[model samples]
Target: SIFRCRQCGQTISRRDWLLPMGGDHEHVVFNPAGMIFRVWCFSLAQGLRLIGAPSGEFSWFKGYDWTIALCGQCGSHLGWHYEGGSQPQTFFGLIKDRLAEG
Candidate 1:
């Protein structure tokens, strides 16, 4: 299915879909897996849509975590945020194959 930005209607990708409670706690750091997920940098996006605040535990350490991240231009369920670690690193996981084509 074609997934577009919820706000701006920008083309995100075709193979994009994630269950609210699916998949085990996985990491998308170096981008090794080929399932179709890539690291998204948040500095570029002006506005952003974040799900809910929860406790982070897999990224690095454990603390407050931001849920699904949507396109700033268009509020779409792009990916998620998890910065759990002693030294937290800012990063988001945006689906690759399902990522924006524009």
Candidate 2:
């Protein structure tokens, strides 16, 4: 599958995307239940910070890039990939069921 950014309409590869889950810390673990596959407004900074991490602990700081595949008309979040931390080999699936009808 492919990933993209919702805001800039740019194509993002699996290497550039991160799955995000809400948490108290600066970064959150990628949760499949809350997975989103597209880039949001905050994605760039998050991605940079995640990539710069030396210990890999802050890798989760980046959220899933849910910018791609978003509802083109409404800009609603659609689906995303999860490839941060230990789940590098895993790809979080899309949330097609939640897509709104236009």
Candidate 3:
């Protein structure tokens, strides 16, 4: 089965699950053991104000907005993405060598 980033449509490999930066919490970091593709409809509303966009610039973070799909036959995690982002960003777990999936 193959795994990919739903945002950038990049292929995600098992090797990506072994990154050196194991537990950094600030920058979209993910644990190697938590790198499973079993994501199922989770959503969080991160304020765009934190990034200093604008006062009225609010966005919705919907569960269905980003999705993790499988190949069905092969049962591979293909990718995910936000509904409103300008460009899709690929998720590569926390570290450089680790993938976002187990």
Candidate 4:
């Protein structure tokens, strides 16, 4: 399947596009919380512009681990790729509100 950014219409990916990741990689986000809603999610497979790392208050999030993810074109906290989850492997939890399904 395929998807895009609801704000900029940028292409997200063609594979691993889990508009709501499968089991063993289930989750959303809540740091800068928003109204309760479903977010289409995907896994970390590459070809994305979202990038950044953890520090200070957010350090605990990655502290000697992984980095956070955001829109490379619009600078939004889209989500993050972590090495931890219900199972194992690189998992990316994308902010559903920041995406446009196509």
TM-score of each: 0.41, 0.23, 0.24, 0.57
The per-model lDDT (C-alpha) reads 0.47, 0.33, 0.29, 0.52
Count of backbone clashes, every candidate in sequence? 6, 15, 8, 5
* lDDT (Cα, tens digit) per residue for candidate 3, span 13-82: 4432322222331234232465533222212211111111222122122221333333333433433323
User: Looking at candidate 3, what is the lDDT of residue 91?
Assistant: 25
Order of models, best TM-score first: 4, 1, 3, 2
Query: On residues 1-102, what C-alpha lDDT tens digit does candidate 1 reach at each position?
Result: 654565576754343333222232233543224344544333123245666774554333235364666776656566665554223344444544335443
* True-structure RMSD, every candidate: 9.9, 11.5, 12.8, 4.6
Residue-pair clash count for candidate 2: 15
Q: In model 1, which regions exceed 4 Å deviation?
A: 1-46, 57-66, 86-88
* Residue pairs that clash (backbone atoms under 3 angstroms), model 1: 12-99, 12-100, 60-84, 60-85, 61-84, 61-85
TM-score of model 4 relative to the true fold?
Answer: 0.57
How large an RMSD does model 4 have? Answer: 4.6
Residue 39, candidate 1: how far off, in angstroms?
6.0
Best by lDDT: 4
Candidate 1 has a TM-score of: 0.41
Span of ten consecutive residues with least summed lDDT in model 4: 55-64
Candidate 3: list runs displaced more than 4 Å.
1-33, 36-64, 87-102
Query: To one decimal, what is the Cα RMSD in angstroms of model 2 from the true structure?
Result: 11.5
